[PDB]
Amino acid sequence: MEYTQLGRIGLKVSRLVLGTMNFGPTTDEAESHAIMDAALDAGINFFDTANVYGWGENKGRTEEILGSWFAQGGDRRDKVVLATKVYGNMGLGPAWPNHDKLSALNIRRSVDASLKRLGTDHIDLYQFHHVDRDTPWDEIWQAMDVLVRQGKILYVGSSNFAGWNIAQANETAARHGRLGLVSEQCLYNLCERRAEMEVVPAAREYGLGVIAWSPLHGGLLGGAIRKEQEGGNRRAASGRAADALKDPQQREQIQRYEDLLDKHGLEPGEVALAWLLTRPGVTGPIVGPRTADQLASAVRAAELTLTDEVLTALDEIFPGPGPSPEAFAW
Amino acid sequence: MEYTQLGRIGLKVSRLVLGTMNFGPTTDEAESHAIMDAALDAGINFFDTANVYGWGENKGRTEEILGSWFAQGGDRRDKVVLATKVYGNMGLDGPAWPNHDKLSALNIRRSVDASLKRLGTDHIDLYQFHHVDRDTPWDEIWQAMDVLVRQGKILYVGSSNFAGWNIAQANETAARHGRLGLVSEQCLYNLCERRAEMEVVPAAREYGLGVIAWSPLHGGLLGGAIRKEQEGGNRRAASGRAADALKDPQQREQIQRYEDLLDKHGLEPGEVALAWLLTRPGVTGPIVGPRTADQLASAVRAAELTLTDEVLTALDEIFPGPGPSPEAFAW
Amino acid sequence: MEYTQLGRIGLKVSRLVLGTMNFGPTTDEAESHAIMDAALDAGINFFDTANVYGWGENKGRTEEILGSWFAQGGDRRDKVVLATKVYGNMGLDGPAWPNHDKLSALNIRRSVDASLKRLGTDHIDLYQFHHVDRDTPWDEIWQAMDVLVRQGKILYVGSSNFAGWNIAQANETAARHGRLGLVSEQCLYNLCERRAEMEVVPAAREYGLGVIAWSPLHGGLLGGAIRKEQEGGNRRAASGRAADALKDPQQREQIQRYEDLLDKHGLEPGEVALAWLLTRPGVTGPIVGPRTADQLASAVRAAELTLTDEVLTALDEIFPGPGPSPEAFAW
Amino acid sequence: MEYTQLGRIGLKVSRLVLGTMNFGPTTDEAESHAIMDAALDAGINFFDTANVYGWGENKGRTEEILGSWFAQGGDRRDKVVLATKVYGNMGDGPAWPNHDKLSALNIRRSVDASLKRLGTDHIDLYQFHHVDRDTPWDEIWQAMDVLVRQGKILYVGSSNFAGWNIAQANETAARHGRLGLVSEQCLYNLCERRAEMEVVPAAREYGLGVIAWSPLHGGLLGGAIRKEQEGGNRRAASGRAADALKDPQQREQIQRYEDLLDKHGLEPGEVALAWLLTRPGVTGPIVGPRTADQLASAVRAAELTLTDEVLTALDEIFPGPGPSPEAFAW
Ligand SMILES: NC(=O)C1=CN([C@@H]2O[C@H](COP(=O)(O)OP(=O)(O)OC[C@H]3O[C@@H](n4cnc5c(N)ncnc54)[C@H](OP(=O)(O)O)[C@@H]3O)[C@@H](O)[C@H]2O)C=CC1
Numbered sequence A: 001m002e003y004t005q006l007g008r009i010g011l012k013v014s015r016l017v018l019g020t021m022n023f024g025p026t027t028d029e030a031e032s033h034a035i036m037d038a039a040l041d042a043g044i045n046f047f048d049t050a051n052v053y054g055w056g057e058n059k060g061r062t063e064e065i066l067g068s069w070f071a072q073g074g075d076r077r078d079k080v081v082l083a084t085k086v087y088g089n090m091g092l093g094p095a096w097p098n099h100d101k102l103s104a105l106n107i108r109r110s111v112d113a114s115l116k117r118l119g120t121d122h123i124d125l126y127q128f129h130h131v132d133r134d135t136p137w138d139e140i141w142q143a144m145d146v147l148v149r150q151g152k153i154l155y156v157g158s159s160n161f162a163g164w165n166i167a168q169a170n171e172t173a174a175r176h177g178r179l180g181l182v183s184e185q186c187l188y189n190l191c192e193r194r195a196e197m198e199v200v201p202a203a204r205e206y207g208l209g210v211i212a213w214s215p216l217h218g219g220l221l222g223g224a225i226r227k228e229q230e231g232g233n234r235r236a237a238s239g240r241a242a243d244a245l246k247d248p249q250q251r252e253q254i255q256r257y258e259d260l261l262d263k264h265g266l267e268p269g270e271v272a273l274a275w276l277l278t279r280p281g282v283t284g285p286i287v288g289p290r291t292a293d294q295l296a297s298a299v300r301a302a303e304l305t306l307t308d309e310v311l312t313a314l315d316e317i318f319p320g321p322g323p324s325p326e327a328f329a330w
Numbered sequence B, C: 001m002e003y004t005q006l007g008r009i010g011l012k013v014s015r016l017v018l019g020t021m022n023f024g025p026t027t028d029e030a031e032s033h034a035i036m037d038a039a040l041d042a043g044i045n046f047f048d049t050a051n052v053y054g055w056g057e058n059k060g061r062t063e064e065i066l067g068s069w070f071a072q073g074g075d076r077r078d079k080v081v082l083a084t085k086v087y088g089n090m091g092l093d094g095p096a097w098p099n100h101d102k103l104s105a106l107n108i109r110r111s112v113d114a115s116l117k118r119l120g121t122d123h124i125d126l127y128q129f130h131h132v133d134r135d136t137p138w139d140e141i142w143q144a145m146d147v148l149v150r151q152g153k154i155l156y157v158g159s160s161n162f163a164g165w166n167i168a169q170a171n172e173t174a175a176r177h178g179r180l181g182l183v184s185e186q187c188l189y190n191l192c193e194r195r196a197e198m199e200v201v202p203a204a205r206e207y208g209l210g211v212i213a214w215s216p217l218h219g220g221l222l223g224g225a226i227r228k229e230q231e232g233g234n235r236r237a238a239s240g241r242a243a244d245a246l247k248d249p250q251q252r253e254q255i256q257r258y259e260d261l262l263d264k265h266g267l268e269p270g271e272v273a274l275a276w277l278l279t280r281p282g283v284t285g286p287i288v289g290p291r292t293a294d295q296l297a298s299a300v301r302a303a304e305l306t307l308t309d310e311v312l313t314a315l316d317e318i319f320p321g322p323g324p325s326p327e328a329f330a331w
Numbered sequence D: 001m002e003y004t005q006l007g008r009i010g011l012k013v014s015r016l017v018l019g020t021m022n023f024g025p026t027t028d029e030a031e032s033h034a035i036m037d038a039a040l041d042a043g044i045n046f047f048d049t050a051n052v053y054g055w056g057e058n059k060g061r062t063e064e065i066l067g068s069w070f071a072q073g074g075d076r077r078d079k080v081v082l083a084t085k086v087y088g089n090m091g092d093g094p095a096w097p098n099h100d101k102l103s104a105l106n107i108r109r110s111v112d113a114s115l116k117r118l119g120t121d122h123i124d125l126y127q128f129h130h131v132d133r134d135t136p137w138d139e140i141w142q143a144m145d146v147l148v149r150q151g152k153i154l155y156v157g158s159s160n161f162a163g164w165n166i167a168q169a170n171e172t173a174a175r176h177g178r179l180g181l182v183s184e185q186c187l188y189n190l191c192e193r194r195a196e197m198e199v200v201p202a203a204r205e206y207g208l209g210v211i212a213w214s215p216l217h218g219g220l221l222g223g224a225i226r227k228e229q230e231g232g233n234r235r236a237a238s239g240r241a242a243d244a245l246k247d248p249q250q251r252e253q254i255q256r257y258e259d260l261l262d263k264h265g266l267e268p269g270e271v272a273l274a275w276l277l278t279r280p281g282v283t284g285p286i287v288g289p290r291t292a293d294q295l296a297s298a299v300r301a302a303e304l305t306l307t308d309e310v311l312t313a314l315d316e317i318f319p320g321p322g323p324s325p326e327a328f329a330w
């Protein structure tokens, strides 16, 4: 397993991050535990979760499933960089005021609930699930600093920010000696490359890690066409993946992709993961296995070496915009 | 004429900015001078130029045309908010001698002196970075700009062709030491190119910069370029961005739908494109690029136009925009 | 016993610092406790340890031995300035699990709780970075240290095996936000190894840090290791730094001339090495490394020694220093 | 000609810096002018001089030689990044108090005398010739900021600093908005590598350029043994080169070096220049041609590509210490 610094900070992380969103809705508790043990054995030390994971009436069950994995002992908590999230609504449409978003009030109650469900006295990387345009950064950093100085959190990260939100957050932190965002968790894969325009350039300038969520675009990139005939699609049958397959242009993009990999004898989920590991500034993908065999597939992807010929072919099927301002001006 | 504050600062500007890029290579000195006179009489107090305008062997020619305009007296200099730019290469077109382009303190020093001499004035009101320079750090840039501010050679600093995050970083760096940051960003924004909506304009609004849109007609493409296609002359639409766009069928189809839609409503295409930008949140105004006195008078009419809800939603249907990031590509 | 301030801060320490690295692997618990009783009896109030001391499968034993010493009551904890360290890997062999070594806020959090538990105390007086960690930035480091300061778990932060510029960067970073910076640097400094004079000690003096010299006998090399090679008696001087040095003919001759020189002046070689450090400008004191009670008594006599200008000049001839940079390699 | 950024700042410089110390005492004015013409023709845009160059009674002659070179028009001043120094006594022996070192008083008088000899209104890179332990950085930066605001200088650089002087200087400048040191000029070559302990690592941390002076160790690395018997006005017959040849251990090193290059068919002056160009953090060497052909030789050196065998062999003869604390502790 390959390791790297999370951006500028002293934390060392595997280049595969174990995403846990499937643990609960799609993967049951015992198989989730087995995937986590296997991730440790493979050397993955960085787990991503969220308070909202679990779905519906079971929002929080993913954190509880990690809670019960830690509670088995065997140094599991001490070996894992534990990341979770605040912002989302923990109830079932419109949230009660200040029971979502990034007000200091919601941060206080959400961290306590997450810490209770995880059965740990601290979160290593506490992440904003989304930018909240209504909460100023001096409020946010007050809230996080209270938790840092109490020992309840160590690091702060962002998710689904714009590039200028990262700049504003970390400049505001720096004014008063505070450690800023250490990482941005953004959507980035072969199908969706617009994080290249500003999010990733800004993350690189401010020395944040970049960890890519839905690195297979919700399963689209892991052989979802091939699997339509055999009914192997689960997550790839809803959400981003199903919407993309319904669109003729996007579907044919995936078709050329699966065909090209057939010619080269490569697995499509592994190529997509390995492709992110080549992108400048990307710490690594947050893999989303539903089975232990999908985790092992991800582990093999971390060792894949893509040829320049495949890389340029993938670029031709899935072009990116590159950085702003050049992406749309000159 | 409608006026507004330039973002957060005390400067008041007309919602039309006179672009001068045509003055020299496309419009001769005499028509250039009459456009500016008509612009002043219309109430336009905000002029944008650059050291490189004039093109080719005549880079600098535009600044000189503005200089001989000012030298006529008549309160012209005192009345005009004068903006020029630094970054471009001023030598032989081709690879620049090191530090004769970009935003080193060295090039800023030599460029502003040469602009002042050609403009024949002792100060520039709005000195703009023509493009982001990823290799010059902001404490170097702001040192160079502040030297000029304290000498009285410039008043305000602005940006052009920045990423939203460059705006944040520039103004956070300026604010740490009590300097006035960027006051405006000059970005490509029109009906055909809306991606400044993702992060440039949101960042500019958060930091209280003016937003002034260059090539607001996409270089002539939205000026009735199809209807006038087989016409001739020195039309800006007959080459560059507008021509290349008309040879792509998808882009060409958009313009066709647009000109047809405006026939149905009795509206001029050039005028609608300007009026449409004036409705966009955070936009100070377009930088209009008249070739002729009559195109300027037409720009002035566009600032009095009131587009209906019906035309706006139809314009959206032809030219959809992405919205802000991250919602534009994530959720 | 002579006392001095630790660099610029209000803390007063004896100029002999008790090192404990031998306590466990080389000196058993009973003799380690006797050595500590006798150090307190001689007025030594400043003890240096580390989480890794104990070796191999017994990393942590040295801290546990101090813990059981403090547990014997008698004002011991209250009387001693207790220093320990974080950075080292606590596991047996091979590369550490990620973030179970080095200076991330994550390892700092877990290392100080394990140290506090082994030491059986609610605070460490001087919490030291065992080594520079080039991968952790200072705003992360000072965040984790400031958490412990405000909780009352540490009082003071120090460095060890830093470069001079790390010292400067650390304390400049702390001072920008009203944090007390590093209060001391623990660096290798003795007759045999003098290159800390190039830049580490100068930076430490500029920033007002104490300087406490580890392996002040160069791992026993300077305590009569050649004589004891035939009489028997080398333990620590049989391995590591000292064994390597004697494997080199030029370094072995330095030691020979050293022991010859002191035979003639009637002086003990370990005592001269300690006393020489006490003369070096900026040096708070040596961290003595006694293996036995009698080696501690020897160290205490060395703190009363006075080395003549003749001896000092002879030692400088045998063991030349580089002096400060840039003069050491340039002019 | 290869160009690079001078450390972190926006200034672009040729990786060969033209040193001028020979111009006056060693190379006459006509050939000095000729060397400068050749340097500019080869694309070198970065010249180093000092107020004291000229030596003895003729301190200032080098700046005067550059002054008359600029006066021959040709876009010369506009094209050259012009660098000189302050610290040295301009009156030889014990200096009148405040007529050497870095007091605000000596800085004021030295820069005016330098600007007059150079016949220019501004110095692009004004460098401290040496650390001055008796002047504090708030006084130095006050003096330099007066010059920046009057437009008499653009950039400040250091020379013969310790690494910790660099950190203290730039931390002090950054505290109050000032651009700190942009470059450090240090003794660094195959024979003298102790800048690797702390000077160069500190420069790299603070984003300083690194330009090495006497990159052939005063001619010692330019073929000095092959040429030891020949007469003439050779730098290698005097100064530090001659002292090293009288030490047996340093002569043997040069012998092995010259012999090694005989077998590979390489020129010793060019190899040493090319070697510095491989060192991480190093902007470039400050070449010290005595003749126009020695300049052409330096230009070829910047195009040489040393092989790993040669690099390993050079490391065997000329071992470096590496960074502190590892170089002496662990
Ligand atoms: N910050 C945010 O806003 C978001 C965060 N995340 C985080 O990132 C993690 C990954 O997100 P996710 O969408 O699940 O990731 P993916 O894009 O990789 O989709 C996961 C699905 O892809 C399929 N798949 C997984 N691994 C492989 C493999 N080797 N080979 C082939 N197919 C494979 C499975 O599909 P199938 O079920 O059909 O078998 C899996 O359920 C999440 O667990 C979460 O922690 C994700 C969403 C939003």
Ligand SMILES: NC(=O)C1=CN([C@@H]2O[C@H](COP(=O)(O)OP(=O)(O)OC[C@H]3O[C@@H](n4cnc5c(N)ncnc54)[C@H](OP(=O)(O)O)[C@@H]3O)[C@@H](O)[C@H]2O)C=CC1
Pocket (backbone or CB within 6 Å): A050, A052, A088, A089, A218, A238, A239, A240, A241, B330, B331
């Ligand atoms: N209230 C909640 O907690 C959640 C609500 N949803 C709903 O699902 C819809 C789209 O997601 P889905 O169809 O299930 O699968 P998708 O393939 O479209 O999206 C996959 C992941 O993207 C993230 N996401 C996408 N859209 C939203 C949104 N409005 N709000 C919050 N997170 C979003 C979620 O991950 P992530 O949880 O990391 O944000 C989701 O698991 C949304 O309209 C949303 O209302 C989806 C997930 C959580």
Ligand SMILES: NC(=O)C1=CN([C@@H]2O[C@H](COP(=O)(O)OP(=O)(O)OC[C@H]3O[C@@H](n4cnc5c(N)ncnc54)[C@H](OP(=O)(O)O)[C@@H]3O)[C@@H](O)[C@H]2O)C=CC1
Pocket (backbone or CB within 6 Å): B018, B019, B020, B021, B022, B048, B049, B130, B160, B161, B186, B187, B213, B214, B215, B216, B217, B218, B219, B220, B221, B222, B223, B224, B234, B235, B236, B237, B238, B269, B270, B271, B287, B288, B289, B290, B291, B295, B296, B298, B299
């Ligand atoms: N910061 C930067 O990088 C850039 C800055 N700019 C600045 O922005 C200014 C505008 O740029 P430019 O490309 O010229 O802007 P436009 O795209 O609006 O104008 C180009 C052409 O549009 C047509 N036109 C202009 N006004 C009208 C009008 N009322 N009605 C109908 N057609 C009209 C003319 O085309 P035709 O000749 O075919 O009739 C004109 O020559 C420039 O002068 C410059 O100051 C411009 C480019 C880059």
Ligand SMILES: NC(=O)C1=CN([C@@H]2O[C@H](COP(=O)(O)OP(=O)(O)OC[C@H]3O[C@@H](n4cnc5c(N)ncnc54)[C@H](OP(=O)(O)O)[C@@H]3O)[C@@H](O)[C@H]2O)C=CC1
Pocket (backbone or CB within 6 Å): A330, B021, B022, B025, B026, B050, B052, B055, B219, B239, B240, B241, B242
């Ligand atoms: N053969 C030619 O190209 C000739 C051009 N001109 C004048 O040049 C202008 C049109 O420029 P053109 O490039 O031909 O067509 P484009 O439509 O491609 O360029 C429009 C403007 O965008 C900006 N720009 C676009 N690309 C670049 C780039 N690599 N680098 C720097 N700036 C860029 C320039 O404005 P900005 O300078 O503000 O950056 C340019 O004037 C017109 O004003 C025309 O009068 C005159 C005679 C001949």
Ligand SMILES: NC(=O)C1=CN([C@@H]2O[C@H](COP(=O)(O)OP(=O)(O)OC[C@H]3O[C@@H](n4cnc5c(N)ncnc54)[C@H](OP(=O)(O)O)[C@@H]3O)[C@@H](O)[C@H]2O)C=CC1
Pocket (backbone or CB within 6 Å): C018, C019, C020, C021, C022, C048, C049, C130, C160, C161, C186, C187, C213, C214, C215, C216, C217, C218, C219, C220, C221, C222, C223, C224, C233, C234, C235, C236, C237, C238, C269, C270, C271, C287, C288, C289, C290, C291, C295, C296, C298, C299
């Ligand atoms: N920060 C860091 O990296 C380091 C920290 N340290 C700290 O510094 C302390 C000293 O280190 P250490 O290497 O032990 O110091 P020394 O250089 O003094 O070596 C100790 C050995 O020297 C001999 N000796 C000790 N005292 C005398 C004396 N009066 N007279 C004659 N010989 C004597 C004994 O040798 P013998 O066994 O042969 O009898 C002893 O085991 C350590 O305990 C530790 O606290 C030390 C190493 C690294």
Ligand SMILES: NC(=O)C1=CN([C@@H]2O[C@H](COP(=O)(O)OP(=O)(O)OC[C@H]3O[C@@H](n4cnc5c(N)ncnc54)[C@H](OP(=O)(O)O)[C@@H]3O)[C@@H](O)[C@H]2O)C=CC1
Pocket (backbone or CB within 6 Å): C021, C050, C052, C130, C219, C239, C240, C241, C242, D330
């Ligand atoms: N702590 C150790 O002794 C470790 C040693 N090693 C390996 O053993 C060699 C030195 O062992 P030893 O004979 O005891 O050293 P020496 O006898 O030569 O030096 C004595 C002390 O120096 C310190 N030290 C020296 N090298 C290292 C190193 N890589 N890492 C951490 N501390 C070091 C240790 O003190 P202190 O613990 O205070 O730093 C050691 O007690 C090294 O080459 C290394 O490869 C590897 C990891 C840890």
Ligand SMILES: NC(=O)C1=CN([C@@H]2O[C@H](COP(=O)(O)OP(=O)(O)OC[C@H]3O[C@@H](n4cnc5c(N)ncnc54)[C@H](OP(=O)(O)O)[C@@H]3O)[C@@H](O)[C@H]2O)C=CC1
Pocket (backbone or CB within 6 Å): D018, D019, D020, D021, D022, D048, D049, D129, D159, D160, D185, D212, D213, D214, D215, D216, D217, D218, D219, D220, D221, D222, D223, D233, D234, D235, D236, D237, D268, D269, D270, D286, D287, D288, D289, D290, D293, D294, D295, D296, D297, D298
């Ligand atoms: N900041 C400081 O303290 C210092 C600054 N400097 C600056 O650095 C510059 C270089 O210093 P300097 O000592 O002259 O550098 P060198 O050590 O490279 O040059 C001295 C001699 O090297 C020989 N030589 C030069 N070029 C070549 C070449 N291609 N091929 C073979 N031999 C060659 C010549 O020796 P020979 O005559 O025998 O043929 C030359 O006179 C100086 O001009 C000055 O700008 C220099 C010293 C101190």
Ligand SMILES: NC(=O)C1=CN([C@@H]2O[C@H](COP(=O)(O)OP(=O)(O)OC[C@H]3O[C@@H](n4cnc5c(N)ncnc54)[C@H](OP(=O)(O)O)[C@@H]3O)[C@@H](O)[C@H]2O)C=CC1
Pocket (backbone or CB within 6 Å): C330, C331, D021, D022, D025, D026, D050, D052, D055, D218, D238, D239, D240, D241
């Ligand atoms: N002493 C002599 O016999 C004569 C010397 N010269 C010139 O002086 C240079 C010969 O070097 P030399 O000084 O004799 O001995 P070195 O060769 O050891 O010195 C070479 C350079 O290092 C720098 N330097 C070295 N030591 C000192 C020091 N105490 N103080 C200040 N700077 C120092 C000087 O450059 P920097 O000034 O940049 O610091 C010097 O030019 C040549 O450039 C020569 O042209 C000319 C006529 C007679």
